[PDB]
Amino acid sequence: MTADLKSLAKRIYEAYLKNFNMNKVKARVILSPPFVIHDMETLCMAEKTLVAKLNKEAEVRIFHCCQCTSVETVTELTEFAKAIPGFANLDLNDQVTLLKYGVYEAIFAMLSSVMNKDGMLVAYGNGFITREFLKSLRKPFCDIMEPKFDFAMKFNALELDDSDISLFVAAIICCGDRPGLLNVGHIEKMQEGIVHVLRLHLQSNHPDDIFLFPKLLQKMADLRQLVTEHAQLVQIIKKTESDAALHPLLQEIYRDMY
Ligand SMILES: CC(C)(Sc1ccc(CCN(CCCCC2CCCCC2)C(=O)NC2CCCCC2)cc1)C(=O)O
């Protein structure tokens, strides 16, 4: 692994630590105290301390808070993408397409860092929602998070650190086979450079697992399918729930996606 490829992996890693408020090391520290949301009583208590200004059904209030975090994460991923060699040199329209299809694959990948089998760290490290509370919400809102917990438990078993995850997220953003891409050839070259660094980095950082790279390629495919199914559930909610309107930035991300 040349000093240049180590520099690329380090640049990506530092751009990850700079652009995302929560990293896996800090998440594990806290998860090892945040306010525990495990029932309706504690949800209301958390709302008054953590999202005071926020009345509708609990399920709808939660859904709105979730939208706020997604808008924030999309903004963070947008600045992170600049660290990827060649991304800023891409056509402005291609940069939008890559981020459009990539953001939620990256969101659910990064969500794993703050999940354990019993729940998830939320609200900038200050809350912890239980997995069972989320399952207790009325349909269809109880169906949103459980497939993400399912993915995260397998993803977390790979025992990646943020030096790996930063490259993985970069690779997700660099997928050349997104619909609507103009300069597909340059994107594939850009993807190839990130994937090449990821492969060498995993060999260096995880010599114990000789299959980690193909394992992560499969997780990228799993995430694409997870996002397809997520978008389908979001469309049902928007259509069936006469009070869960979508933030405009998010509605534009899902527009014409799948
Ligand atoms: C909003 C849809 C329509 S569905 C959707 C999408 C994503 C999520 C996960 C949101 N979340 C819980 C945010 C929980 C907020 C908490 C609720 C209880 C009261 C206190 C505040 C969270 O922590 N996300 C992390 C953010 C850091 C980076 C990684 C992801 C939930 C639903 C969308 O598609 O965007």
Tab-separated table of C-alpha atoms and ligand atoms in Angstrom:
chain	number	residue	atom	x	y	z
A	1	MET	CA	0.000	0.000	0.000
A	2	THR	CA	1.781	3.096	-1.303
A	3	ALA	CA	2.143	6.238	0.786
A	4	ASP	CA	-0.301	7.873	-1.638
A	5	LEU	CA	-3.019	5.267	-1.073
A	6	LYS	CA	-2.465	5.501	2.680
A	7	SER	CA	-2.840	9.266	2.270
A	8	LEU	CA	-6.115	8.738	0.406
A	9	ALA	CA	-7.472	6.423	3.110
A	10	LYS	CA	-6.335	8.895	5.765
A	11	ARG	CA	-7.896	11.835	3.919
A	12	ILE	CA	-11.213	9.974	3.698
A	13	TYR	CA	-11.020	8.940	7.358
A	14	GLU	CA	-10.329	12.487	8.523
A	15	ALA	CA	-13.123	13.835	6.326
A	16	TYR	CA	-15.433	11.287	7.974
A	17	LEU	CA	-14.435	12.328	11.500
A	18	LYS	CA	-14.786	16.017	10.628
A	19	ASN	CA	-18.138	15.875	8.849
A	20	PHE	CA	-20.161	13.467	11.021
A	21	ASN	CA	-20.981	14.456	14.592
A	22	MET	CA	-21.163	10.824	15.742
A	23	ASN	CA	-18.343	8.356	15.182
A	24	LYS	CA	-18.252	4.720	16.180
A	25	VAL	CA	-15.643	5.113	18.926
A	26	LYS	CA	-17.670	7.806	20.689
A	27	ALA	CA	-20.905	5.890	20.118
A	28	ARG	CA	-19.458	2.783	21.794
A	29	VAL	CA	-18.217	4.883	24.722
A	30	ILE	CA	-21.697	6.275	25.356
A	31	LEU	CA	-23.373	2.907	24.701
A	32	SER	CA	-21.066	1.313	27.295
A	33	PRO	CA	-25.949	8.261	30.664
A	34	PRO	CA	-28.308	8.863	27.728
A	35	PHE	CA	-32.002	9.190	28.498
A	36	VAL	CA	-33.738	5.887	27.801
A	37	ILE	CA	-36.882	5.980	25.667
A	38	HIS	CA	-38.637	2.653	26.241
A	39	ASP	CA	-42.364	3.525	26.476
A	40	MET	CA	-44.804	6.370	25.857
A	41	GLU	CA	-44.116	7.977	29.244
A	42	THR	CA	-40.381	8.262	28.585
A	43	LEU	CA	-40.886	9.323	24.952
A	44	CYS	CA	-42.897	12.317	26.174
A	45	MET	CA	-40.258	13.078	28.799
A	46	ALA	CA	-37.490	12.934	26.193
A	47	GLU	CA	-39.481	15.186	23.872
A	48	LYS	CA	-39.765	17.897	26.533
A	49	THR	CA	-36.041	17.828	27.350
A	50	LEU	CA	-34.481	16.968	23.958
A	51	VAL	CA	-36.884	18.422	21.365
A	52	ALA	CA	-38.766	20.900	23.546
A	53	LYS	CA	-40.286	23.044	20.793
A	54	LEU	CA	-41.994	19.955	19.346
A	55	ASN	CA	-49.562	17.785	19.419
A	56	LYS	CA	-50.029	14.868	17.024
A	57	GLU	CA	-49.843	11.087	17.455
A	58	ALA	CA	-46.617	9.889	19.069
A	59	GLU	CA	-45.803	7.894	15.933
A	60	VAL	CA	-46.060	11.043	13.801
A	61	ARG	CA	-43.963	13.130	16.210
A	62	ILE	CA	-41.234	10.486	16.096
A	63	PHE	CA	-41.459	10.390	12.291
A	64	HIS	CA	-40.952	14.170	12.112
A	65	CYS	CA	-37.934	14.082	14.427
A	66	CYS	CA	-36.486	11.319	12.263
A	67	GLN	CA	-36.923	13.510	9.172
A	68	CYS	CA	-34.970	16.315	10.845
A	69	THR	CA	-31.996	14.028	11.483
A	70	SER	CA	-32.090	12.681	7.919
A	71	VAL	CA	-31.975	16.205	6.482
A	72	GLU	CA	-28.956	16.901	8.704
A	73	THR	CA	-27.205	13.659	7.722
A	74	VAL	CA	-27.787	14.366	4.026
A	75	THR	CA	-26.092	17.739	4.505
A	76	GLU	CA	-23.149	16.098	6.278
A	77	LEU	CA	-22.759	13.441	3.568
A	78	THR	CA	-22.799	16.201	0.940
A	79	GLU	CA	-19.723	17.877	2.444
A	80	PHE	CA	-18.024	14.526	3.053
A	81	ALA	CA	-18.284	13.608	-0.636
A	82	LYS	CA	-15.839	16.407	-1.498
A	83	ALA	CA	-12.998	14.412	0.081
A	84	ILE	CA	-13.379	11.703	-2.586
A	85	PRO	CA	-10.725	12.197	-5.302
A	86	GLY	CA	-12.537	13.321	-8.427
A	87	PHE	CA	-15.962	13.915	-6.882
A	88	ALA	CA	-15.693	17.716	-6.875
A	89	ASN	CA	-14.285	17.503	-10.423
A	90	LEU	CA	-17.452	15.709	-11.553
A	91	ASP	CA	-20.308	17.430	-13.330
A	92	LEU	CA	-22.626	19.149	-10.853
A	93	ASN	CA	-25.545	17.074	-12.126
A	94	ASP	CA	-23.670	13.797	-11.608
A	95	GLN	CA	-22.758	14.843	-8.066
A	96	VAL	CA	-26.485	15.151	-7.351
A	97	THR	CA	-27.311	11.760	-8.861
A	98	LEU	CA	-24.583	9.977	-6.890
A	99	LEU	CA	-25.708	11.566	-3.619
A	100	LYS	CA	-29.396	10.973	-4.433
A	101	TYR	CA	-29.021	7.187	-4.585
A	102	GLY	CA	-26.171	6.976	-2.090
A	103	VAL	CA	-27.320	8.981	0.927
A	104	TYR	CA	-29.699	6.407	2.392
A	105	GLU	CA	-27.333	3.521	1.747
A	106	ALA	CA	-24.739	5.510	3.691
A	107	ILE	CA	-27.269	6.513	6.370
A	108	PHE	CA	-28.241	2.931	7.123
A	109	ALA	CA	-24.602	1.842	7.079
A	110	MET	CA	-23.647	4.546	9.571
A	111	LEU	CA	-26.764	3.899	11.654
A	112	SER	CA	-25.242	0.516	12.562
A	113	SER	CA	-22.517	2.344	14.509
A	114	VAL	CA	-25.090	3.616	17.016
A	115	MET	CA	-27.148	0.408	17.201
A	116	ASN	CA	-26.906	-2.587	19.475
A	117	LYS	CA	-29.310	-5.495	19.804
A	118	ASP	CA	-31.419	-3.591	22.340
A	119	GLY	CA	-31.799	-0.160	20.735
A	120	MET	CA	-30.142	2.869	19.197
A	121	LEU	CA	-28.361	5.989	20.355
A	122	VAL	CA	-30.189	9.122	19.144
A	123	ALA	CA	-30.317	12.903	19.487
A	124	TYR	CA	-26.576	13.581	19.277
A	125	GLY	CA	-25.698	10.951	21.868
A	126	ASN	CA	-28.250	12.124	24.439
A	127	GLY	CA	-31.000	9.533	23.996
A	128	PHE	CA	-31.360	5.798	23.584
A	129	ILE	CA	-34.519	4.362	22.033
A	130	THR	CA	-35.199	0.704	22.659
A	131	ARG	CA	-35.672	-1.666	19.771
A	132	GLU	CA	-38.766	-3.057	21.493
A	133	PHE	CA	-40.349	0.375	21.875
A	134	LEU	CA	-39.971	0.948	18.131
A	135	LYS	CA	-41.603	-2.430	17.473
A	136	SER	CA	-44.515	-1.366	19.700
A	137	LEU	CA	-45.516	1.613	17.544
A	138	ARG	CA	-48.683	1.215	15.510
A	139	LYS	CA	-48.364	0.075	11.921
A	140	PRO	CA	-46.891	1.142	9.687
A	141	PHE	CA	-44.375	3.066	11.806
A	142	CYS	CA	-43.218	-0.052	13.691
A	143	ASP	CA	-42.002	-1.454	10.360
A	144	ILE	CA	-39.459	1.312	9.662
A	145	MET	CA	-36.547	0.531	11.961
A	146	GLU	CA	-36.584	-3.228	12.506
A	147	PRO	CA	-35.019	-4.123	9.102
A	148	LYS	CA	-32.302	-1.581	9.871
A	149	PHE	CA	-31.556	-3.266	13.195
A	150	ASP	CA	-31.438	-6.581	11.327
A	151	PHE	CA	-28.867	-5.208	8.886
A	152	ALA	CA	-26.855	-3.494	11.626
A	153	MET	CA	-26.470	-6.611	13.757
A	154	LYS	CA	-24.811	-8.466	10.870
A	155	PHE	CA	-22.827	-5.404	9.779
A	156	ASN	CA	-21.554	-4.832	13.323
A	157	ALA	CA	-20.387	-8.453	13.535
A	158	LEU	CA	-17.752	-7.564	10.925
A	159	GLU	CA	-16.204	-5.381	13.663
A	160	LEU	CA	-15.269	-2.521	11.355
A	161	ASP	CA	-13.810	0.678	12.733
A	162	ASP	CA	-14.325	4.163	11.363
A	163	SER	CA	-11.194	3.899	9.217
A	164	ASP	CA	-13.029	1.112	7.353
A	165	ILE	CA	-16.494	2.682	7.442
A	166	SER	CA	-15.293	5.997	6.028
A	167	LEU	CA	-13.962	4.191	2.944
A	168	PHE	CA	-17.092	2.039	2.720
A	169	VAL	CA	-19.311	5.142	2.710
A	170	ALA	CA	-17.085	6.761	0.092
A	171	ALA	CA	-17.426	3.607	-2.023
A	172	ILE	CA	-21.226	3.730	-1.649
A	173	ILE	CA	-21.263	7.301	-2.931
A	174	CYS	CA	-19.030	6.331	-5.900
A	175	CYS	CA	-21.321	3.707	-7.452
A	176	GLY	CA	-21.058	4.151	-11.212
A	177	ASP	CA	-24.170	2.106	-12.036
A	178	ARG	CA	-26.640	4.659	-10.662
A	179	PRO	CA	-29.461	5.651	-13.030
A	180	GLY	CA	-29.153	8.955	-14.857
A	181	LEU	CA	-25.369	9.342	-14.720
A	182	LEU	CA	-23.793	11.428	-17.477
A	183	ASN	CA	-20.035	10.804	-17.211
A	184	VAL	CA	-20.304	7.158	-16.203
A	185	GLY	CA	-16.757	6.476	-17.361
A	186	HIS	CA	-15.158	9.012	-15.037
A	187	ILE	CA	-17.304	7.837	-12.115
A	188	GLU	CA	-16.245	4.216	-12.624
A	189	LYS	CA	-12.614	5.344	-12.566
A	190	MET	CA	-13.348	7.340	-9.408
A	191	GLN	CA	-15.109	4.337	-7.865
A	192	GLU	CA	-12.220	2.068	-8.864
A	193	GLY	CA	-9.747	4.280	-6.999
A	194	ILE	CA	-11.786	4.314	-3.791
A	195	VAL	CA	-12.523	0.586	-3.974
A	196	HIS	CA	-8.833	-0.112	-4.581
A	197	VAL	CA	-7.928	1.823	-1.432
A	198	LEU	CA	-10.698	0.082	0.514
A	199	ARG	CA	-9.450	-3.357	-0.548
A	200	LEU	CA	-5.851	-2.645	0.462
A	201	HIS	CA	-6.977	-0.972	3.692
A	202	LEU	CA	-9.057	-3.983	4.732
A	203	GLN	CA	-6.112	-6.290	4.071
A	204	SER	CA	-3.932	-4.072	6.271
A	205	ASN	CA	-6.458	-3.375	9.038
A	206	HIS	CA	-8.184	-6.797	9.147
A	207	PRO	CA	-5.576	-9.461	8.291
A	208	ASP	CA	-7.602	-11.982	10.323
A	209	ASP	CA	-10.564	-11.952	7.883
A	210	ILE	CA	-9.412	-12.766	4.363
A	211	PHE	CA	-12.977	-12.467	3.021
A	212	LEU	CA	-13.839	-9.061	4.498
A	213	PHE	CA	-13.696	-7.266	1.147
A	214	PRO	CA	-16.192	-9.582	-0.632
A	215	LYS	CA	-18.298	-9.576	2.540
A	216	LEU	CA	-18.523	-5.783	2.303
A	217	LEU	CA	-19.296	-5.881	-1.410
A	218	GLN	CA	-22.278	-8.050	-0.475
A	219	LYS	CA	-23.311	-5.590	2.246
A	220	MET	CA	-23.357	-2.832	-0.386
A	221	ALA	CA	-25.815	-4.911	-2.400
A	222	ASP	CA	-27.812	-5.648	0.759
A	223	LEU	CA	-28.000	-1.906	1.476
A	224	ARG	CA	-29.279	-1.133	-2.023
A	225	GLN	CA	-32.090	-3.629	-1.448
A	226	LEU	CA	-32.690	-2.278	2.058
A	227	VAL	CA	-33.068	1.235	0.618
A	228	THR	CA	-35.416	0.049	-2.134
A	229	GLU	CA	-37.686	-1.501	0.484
A	230	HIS	CA	-37.365	1.524	2.759
A	231	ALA	CA	-38.415	3.883	-0.027
A	232	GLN	CA	-41.440	1.653	-0.652
A	233	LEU	CA	-42.497	1.899	3.000
A	234	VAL	CA	-41.943	5.674	2.982
A	235	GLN	CA	-44.236	5.965	-0.041
A	236	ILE	CA	-46.986	4.029	1.761
A	237	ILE	CA	-46.696	6.286	4.812
A	238	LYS	CA	-46.806	9.466	2.729
A	239	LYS	CA	-49.853	8.175	0.849
A	240	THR	CA	-51.733	6.498	3.705
A	241	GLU	CA	-50.850	8.756	6.672
A	242	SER	CA	-52.735	12.045	6.297
A	243	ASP	CA	-50.370	13.792	8.709
A	244	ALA	CA	-46.825	12.503	8.020
A	245	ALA	CA	-45.790	14.943	5.303
A	246	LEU	CA	-42.271	14.667	3.903
A	247	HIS	CA	-39.711	17.422	4.250
A	248	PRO	CA	-39.149	18.909	0.761
A	249	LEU	CA	-35.476	17.934	0.582
A	250	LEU	CA	-36.379	14.349	1.472
A	251	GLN	CA	-39.337	14.187	-0.913
A	252	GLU	CA	-36.948	15.273	-3.684
A	253	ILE	CA	-34.463	12.535	-2.753
A	254	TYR	CA	-37.172	9.876	-2.988
A	255	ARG	CA	-38.643	11.450	-6.141
A	256	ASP	CA	-37.958	9.182	-9.138
A	257	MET	CA	-35.537	7.154	-7.005
A	258	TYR	CA	-37.055	3.673	-7.288
B	1	LIG	C1	-37.368	10.024	7.923
B	1	LIG	C2	-37.642	9.003	6.820
B	1	LIG	C3	-38.932	9.377	6.105
B	1	LIG	S1	-37.740	7.314	7.473
B	1	LIG	C4	-36.422	7.184	8.702
B	1	LIG	C5	-35.098	7.338	8.317
B	1	LIG	C6	-34.093	7.271	9.269
B	1	LIG	C7	-34.420	7.034	10.596
B	1	LIG	C8	-33.339	6.978	11.680
B	1	LIG	C9	-33.271	8.416	12.208
B	1	LIG	N1	-32.620	8.504	13.504
B	1	LIG	C10	-33.415	8.511	14.729
B	1	LIG	C11	-33.819	9.896	15.226
B	1	LIG	C12	-34.654	9.710	16.494
B	1	LIG	C13	-35.029	11.085	17.034
B	1	LIG	C14	-35.562	10.952	18.457
B	1	LIG	C15	-36.968	10.394	18.373
B	1	LIG	C16	-37.590	10.268	19.771
B	1	LIG	C17	-37.555	11.594	20.519
B	1	LIG	C18	-36.141	12.186	20.548
B	1	LIG	C19	-35.614	12.320	19.124
B	1	LIG	C20	-31.177	8.544	13.587
B	1	LIG	O1	-30.618	8.613	14.631
B	1	LIG	N2	-30.431	8.516	12.345
B	1	LIG	C21	-28.991	8.538	12.367
B	1	LIG	C22	-28.471	9.958	12.542
B	1	LIG	C23	-26.946	9.953	12.461
B	1	LIG	C24	-26.446	9.347	11.159
B	1	LIG	C25	-27.015	7.953	10.920
B	1	LIG	C26	-28.536	7.924	11.040
B	1	LIG	C27	-35.747	6.896	10.973
B	1	LIG	C28	-36.745	6.972	10.021
B	1	LIG	C29	-36.473	9.032	5.842
B	1	LIG	O2	-36.422	8.204	4.888
B	1	LIG	O3	-35.566	9.885	6.014
